[PDB]
Design a protein around this ligand. Structure first.
Ligand SMILES: *[C@@H]1O[C@H](CO)[C@@H](O)[C@H](O)[C@H]1NC(C)=O
Ligand SMILES: *[C@@H]1O[C@H](CO)[C@@H](O)[C@H](O)[C@H]1NC(C)=O
Ligand SMILES: *[C@@H]1O[C@H](CO)[C@@H](O)[C@H](O)[C@H]1NC(C)=O
Ligand SMILES: *[C@@H]1O[C@H](CO)[C@@H](O)[C@H](O)[C@H]1NC(C)=O
Ligand SMILES: *[C@@H]1O[C@H](CO)[C@@H](O)[C@H](O)[C@H]1NC(C)=O
Ligand SMILES: *[C@@H]1O[C@H](CO)[C@@H](O)[C@H](O)[C@H]1NC(C)=O
Ligand SMILES: *[C@@H]1O[C@H](CO)[C@@H](O)[C@H](O)[C@H]1NC(C)=O
Ligand SMILES: *[C@@H]1O[C@H](CO)[C@@H](O)[C@H](O)[C@H]1NC(C)=O
Ligand SMILES: *[C@@H]1O[C@H](CO)[C@@H](O)[C@H](O)[C@H]1NC(C)=O
Lengths: 314, 163, 314, 163, 314, 163
């Protein structure tokens, strides 16, 4: 009588502490290479922003008119999205973005700012609606009549909620000191801003800039977070774009940036810009910057793990 | 791969089998209880590694609009560092498990051998290639009893001692 | 004759490369869960700051009057601590904090700034002492008489020591341009500052801010580090809070933030905000942000290591 | 767990012991020199892991006043990354050591067995359950001499050969 | 007949999972300690900057006259290097440095800025050449005559290349508001700057600073990167140091900082400031901050790996 | 280190050798095919660890002009973290490989022994110190045939059985 073990014609080569290429009865892949080219969203409340940029959902350009109060488990930014109609940018923009990505969306609230002694209705053709319009959550404050003075003003908003409030204002920079006075009258203009956390203040800075949508003025957007019960005040005298509504974070979400279609037919927790990674495997070689709940990125294309014994034939 | 100088491609029945050859005829049958123990153990490894984190990571970078270079560089430096580490962890883990998978397979053989050997008191002597020599023609009732660990170690003894 | 090995009625379950739940004769914990709810300080020179905030120890609010020259191996910040009497904040505050935490404390030195043509004795009721006072290491520079001009001035301080000197000045922001001139006269005010490392300059920015201790003005605190032999100069013309004394780091220390009591009866090198971790164990599941000399934080609550052999009974 | 199909809860004496049964009577006594070698080795593992870093880490975060979000986020991202790594290291280390602790225990048995077997020339034959059969009633002087590795391998031989 | 294994009088002690000090037949080192005290550059296009600082290669102080268009695989910064002749510094300097280090060097291009209504030829004795000169890539713009006005001006440069362009301008800060007007006339001066990526603007800030090369004025250097086809514009009215030439990155390189000599006789891919690490070993204890292609830094001075079997003698 | 209670410093020939002593004379000769297999395996380990990354890292710090403290501190914190990790990886890897190097050496012995034992049917009996007893004076033709695995397991049998 003889006793032994099974074997096969064609086995699979693996690596060991000791040998490089040893055959085995069976082996299985340990590194995921298979990607699905869609954002798998089954069972998840998804918001694909398309032409609206994320920061846009706070200030309200026409792109973002349908997103001013959104609600998500999954937020998707697109390459084509813009935060902006009237040429400008956000100070501390990415941090703001990182905030909004995990916010679960936003709920708006009137701050109730009222106005005596100034105009209120500034608009432009970059921001089309029925006609020339502006940033839906913002207000473009002027001097009453085609020139003339801007009253040194104060406004305060008390956050009465249990959550941190997101406050956004804007500083206008006109194409000239000519344009600056025609809007808000002459002299140095100063906006100041304070909370408990916060302490800062701002001046406009007119001059020429490249034309972007045919306009050469820029709007500077800024922002801070009022804690509960803490209060914020705005000392200003012109060149100012007031916040009409403040923002409160809804809950919890995750944000990705991608260029593939949504698909409510597959489930996924690991995302990257060209798709969802669905895998049970401990590792992946698909995208080092995948986010969510993912196998670890590794450099190796492949690492075979033995699932059968050594293999020696006749 | 030494005294069982190869293996049986014909054994499609299980991982570990018997192959006897008395007068009565032929036979090849898997030993499921040794097959399973090994199988149960490869299974163990696979449940410790087909593994799911509950750790969300978010984005700290931006592919559409690049973050400031300095922070961008630290971020990339960190990511790269942490990639090097996991590529290391992955390769070592695979190598270490595969040695132990291998080494545990063979160890399941060598341990089956020596248990059959120990059933067969002095009624038999080790060949030198993982085969056993009977000095008394053993029929095929006697076989499945060598197999289902019953075979009597003194109730065939005397006869075989002589030979 | 038979030979064998010991065993027991009740063993302990552990995990292996191969099996999940296998019993063993004995096993020991590998992850620390036991915390002691006190800051173990035995043998260490400790400073619990209580109501004094760390940055306070540089400028000198009344909280920090007993800490202006402290000496530590172990610095403890408290939640109740404040850096400030007169409402303001520090620019680059955390970096400064990280510096002070490992400084081993601070030694002060008169910079010897003398004054011709201005007042010198600015005070307030936020900073109580016997009466209304100010920041002990700072000097609140004014115009001589209830209005009037501020002489464009210069002051330099040469660091004559072998160590980097910590220089702190302040920019005042008054509630108005009304208040600004009553203090320092009218016109744009400019403070400039240079070393070898350093190059910058500052303007005040008056306007209303929330009342904090009933005051609406803010003081902006700034700071730089003079190297040995390098020199610093202050170009200014008002709105300025001069440094009276400079600071030198003592040696080496560690800084924690906590809310538990001190205890000179236990020894510890791993601290977190709710206590000391004393353990020989390689790992812990107590606080990922523990600082000092600590086991590694891990997610797992428990990881049993076998200290005995396999366990099979009758 | 195979041929020594279980273990002796009664053996409170040491890790590895002897249990004889001749005419003379009974006996159970630990083999301290095999017990110790294993014990000495579990000890080795425990001194390599009850381990103290001399690496201070300081605070880069702030619990009383939150640092700027962007740096806050990178800092958290890094910490989390480095937690994942050490939770991995910890679990693998524990699993790997425990296999080897186990595997080294048994290996201390199998190696004690085969040394006693090798003292007992042909004067005895392996039972098949980790027990030894003497073909000559061995007294209890003869016992502690099997134990304290002295027993004579030819000075009881002839007698037992016959039987 | 007996069978066995070899052994030796004197073996080497190693460590195991189980034992600390066990001897072995042979063992090999696993951690590199051997450093070579030279920058091994064999086969690599190397640029040792010596007295030229890296940022200098963009603006062009006399140190960097021979480096204005360099080409590298390997860039070496020296302790003695300076970016500057006329006392100043760069805003965002290190990021700029990190850019230049991997640029493979720089190629210059005239931006072709022409001037009507101002002087153009500002110089100083800090920047010696045949005589008093200036920053070779820059232009020191003045008012025509020893006082008088600076025309509010605009200049644009369109990047026509396929690569991102590196744009550098400077803000002058004169010792006084006296000196400021003598140069560019009086009144607040404003420089503004915009692209698609970019939005900012600048004021000068005169006042005294320590003398550095006997001068107390500072030049502030700033910079941005024009993308292809995107355009940049400069709104300014004085206190300005215009870019004459823009910069384009050549390709790819690595940058180190060191104080040892070059050596084209040895090959290396792991560098640190005191030399090259040449080793096949997986680890090193030489310098945690080594850059390039390196073994991993570890704390341990030594870790012996067994290459022979256990060792027991007679 | 147990039954082969030591080793042969004289064996400068290879890792594993034979040492016989019949009437004919003396002999010590390495078994190259067992020596090589072990050697081939230490070789394997050395090619998996004398290892070269193709991962460039650049500078994120500055030794001539210190970066801002806050970013400086995060950078140092990260580096230190990643040092702790690799010092851990290094020490464990060395310890784990050295156990396995050792354990694989001995396992190459124990496996050579038991193959010679299996060549020598019943014509011989195990001494108890890793030596083999012949009950028939074996000449030195018979030697290199024990060595070059040829020796006949039944064509010396009968003679030796008797003795
Ligand atoms: C071979 O490995 C694969 C891995 O997916 C596994 O599913 C399969 O059961 C294995 N086959 C055998 C014969 O065990
Ligand atoms: C917030 O303010 C409201 C009304 O002033 C007060 O009732 C409440 O106690 C405050 N909450 C906290 C926690 O400050
Ligand atoms: C970070 O790496 C990504 C690719 O992984 C690259 O696109 C990006 O340019 C890098 N960041 C910086 C600072 O350039
Ligand atoms: C059981 O393990 C503990 C771990 O603390 C150890 O102190 C003790 O000595 C062990 N007991 C035995 C019987 O070895
Ligand atoms: C510092 O300055 C003093 C006096 O000017 C001088 O004696 C000393 O050499 C200087 N030290 C250094 C290192 O610059
Ligand atoms: C970092 O994590 C801590 C808890 O570990 C959390 O309190 C904090 O909010 C996080 N930082 C940021 C950027 O929110
Ligand atoms: C001893 O180890 C060294 C490691 O460099 C190796 O080169 C040499 O071949 C080894 N010697 C023997 C006898 O194997
Ligand atoms: C860049 O501009 C040129 C000329 O205006 C044009 O031909 C080219 O298509 C542009 N390239 C891109 C990619 O914008
Ligand atoms: C970072 O560590 C280096 C030495 O490794 C030290 O010189 C430097 O001071 C540290 N950075 C900070 C923030 O001090």
């Amino acid at each position: 009588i003889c006793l032994g073990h099974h074997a096969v014609s064609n086995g699979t080569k693996v690596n060991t502490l000791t040998e490089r290429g040893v055959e085995v009865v069976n082996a299985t892949e340990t590194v995921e290479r298979t990607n699905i080219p869609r954002i798998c969203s089954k069972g998840k409340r998804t918001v694909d922003l398309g032409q609206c940029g994320l920061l846009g959902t706070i200030t309200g350009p026409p792109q973002c008119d349908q997103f001013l109060e959104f609600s998500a488990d999954l937020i998707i930014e697109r390459r084509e999205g813009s935060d902006v109609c009237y040429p400008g940018k956000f100070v501390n923009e990415e941090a703001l973005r990182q905030i909004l990505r995990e916010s679960g969306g936003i709920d708006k609230e009137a701050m109730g700012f009222t106005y005596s002694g100034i105009r209120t209705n500034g608009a432009t053709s970059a921001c089309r609606r029925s006609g020339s319009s502006f940033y839906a959550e913002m207000k473009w404050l002027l001097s009453n009549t085609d020139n003339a003075a801007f009253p040194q003003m104060t406004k305060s908003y008390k956050n009465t909620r249990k959550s941190p409030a997101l406050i956004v204002w804007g500083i206008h920079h006109s194409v000239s000191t000519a344009e600056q006075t025609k809007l808000y009258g002459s002299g140095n203009k100063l906006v100041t801003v304070g909370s408990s956390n916060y302490q800062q203040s701002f001046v406009p800075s007119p001059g020429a800039r490249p034309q972007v949508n045919g306009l050469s003025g820029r709007i500077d957007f800024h922002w801070l977070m009022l804690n509960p019960n803490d209060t914020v005040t705005f000392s200003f005298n012109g060149a100012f774009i007031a916040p009409d509504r403040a923002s409160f974070l809804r809950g919890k979400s995750m944000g990705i940036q991608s260029g593939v279609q949504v698909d409510a037919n597959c489930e996924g927790d690991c995302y990257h810009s060209g798709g969802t990674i669905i895998s049970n495997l401990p590792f992946q070689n698909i995208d080092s910057r995948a986010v969510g709940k993912c196998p670890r990125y590794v450099k190796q294309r492949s690492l075979l793990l033995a699932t059968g014994m050594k293999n020696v034939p006749e | 791969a030494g005294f069982i100088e190869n293996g049986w491609e014909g054994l499609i029945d299980g991982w570990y089998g018997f192959r006897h050859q008395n007068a009565q005829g032929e036979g090849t049958a898997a030993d499921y209880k040794s097959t399973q123990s090994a199988i149960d153990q490869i299974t163990g490894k696979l449940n410790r590694l087909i593994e799911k984190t509950n750790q969300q990571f978010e984005l700290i970078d931006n592919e559409f609009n690049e973050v400031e270079k300095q922070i961008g560089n630290v971020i990339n430096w960190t990511r790269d560092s942490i990639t090097e580490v996991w590529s290391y962890n992955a390769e070592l883990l695979v190598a270490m498990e595969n040695q132990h998978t291998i080494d545990l397979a063979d160890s399941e053989m060598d341990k089956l051998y020596e248990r059959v050997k120990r059933q067969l008191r002095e009624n038999a002597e080790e060949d030198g290639t993982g085969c056993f020599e009977i000095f008394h023609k053993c029929d095929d009732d006697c076989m499945a009893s060598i197999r289902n660990n019953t075979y009597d170690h003194s109730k065939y003894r005397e006869e075989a001692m002589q030979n």
